Amino acid sequence: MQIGFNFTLTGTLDMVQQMIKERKIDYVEMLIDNFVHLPPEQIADSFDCPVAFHIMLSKYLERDREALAALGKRLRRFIDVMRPVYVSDHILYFTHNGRSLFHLGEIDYGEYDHVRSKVEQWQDMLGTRLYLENYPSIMDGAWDAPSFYERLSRETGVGVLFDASNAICAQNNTGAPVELWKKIIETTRHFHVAGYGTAFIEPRVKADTHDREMAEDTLDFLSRMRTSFDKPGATITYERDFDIDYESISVDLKRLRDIFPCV
Amino acid sequence: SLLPTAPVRIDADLYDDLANPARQSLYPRDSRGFIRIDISLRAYWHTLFDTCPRLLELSGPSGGAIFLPFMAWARENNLAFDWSFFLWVYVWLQQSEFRERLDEDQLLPVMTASATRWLMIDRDIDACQIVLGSRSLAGAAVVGAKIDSIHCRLEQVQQVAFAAPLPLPDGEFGYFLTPGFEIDHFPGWRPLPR
């Protein structure tokens, strides 16, 4: 199991290169569509390790074909220059009737035909195999999502970028057990994990804040299914987007290394 | 233990109310939908006021005297909540009970916030800089450049002053997009989206 960290803001560069030097992470996962006006070589040179791509705002389920295609062609040159270990994106509801959501929506998993056609078009554009992330469900779509992603993957050839903490938000929020994801967990070699928070007015509802250390139920998940997660060529990206404190990240990185020892 | 999904089941049943504070009470307090709407709404509240805290010196600590009437107004005029979001709050402010307390100490943060949001969320490959103009900021503009080097020490949003004077926009605000990271030729202001 390789351990990664997510690079989303240029001000974290020095801290990420330090994590690489000290061998606390083995690769960097970039939120790559934040950087498609950089020279791609310059990012390749800033990390002395393999890189992976995470795409956040393609909005490939709703975006017009012309602007989608241009972004794809630009990402395609980034893939050529950097050879990312994988390329990944989301299944997110961004806009209702022309109005942007600020807290993004879980997709109605009944709408399989629509997602499938859009996913195929976007994977085509990118020219490589695509990994799609699971949503940190609040509402009961959580129970629908495992088989939806399993079917989506077998019909289109996409992969799942299994986000362990999102699945545990889903479990805490909706009851849907993380064991539903067993089959996906044993297939994909690529994972994500992070700390999560709570709704301000209701601590029982979990929110994917990526702002703190991993919870105990999240660590028990990884630890009790460590054989199902770990695999030839398996990777797990730790994600911290807020309270990006070096020391708080270093313990969570070490916690992952304890759960997945090097040999 | 779990909170019931009450009148609904999936997020898709809630889409229409995710940005409407007046319709939140229609869900049971104990229902999960009430909570889900509250999280979406606090996301709107915090995007507005975390980025522009001086707006709370107008509303007061809860932000309500801006948040509620503005959210109702954005639904009425069917605003998109795009990068222009903050600019539209300032527009609403100019016709509100607070219009007498606007000054450049309030104008520049909302201009910086919209320029910042455009350059973080816009994904047009051909647009590299946004230029914002305002009738309350003559001769200067607020420019938002997309990141084009992992090693830039400067802020991505700057106030740039023009040597040749600029036409005041038609509305309170105007904008235009730049294909590279220079500004040559002024193409005319465009009005705010939505």
Ligand SMILES: [Fe+3]
């Ligand atoms: Fe993600």
Ligand SMILES: [Fe+3]
């Ligand atoms: Fe994730």
Ligand SMILES: [Fe+3]
């Ligand atoms: Fe997450």
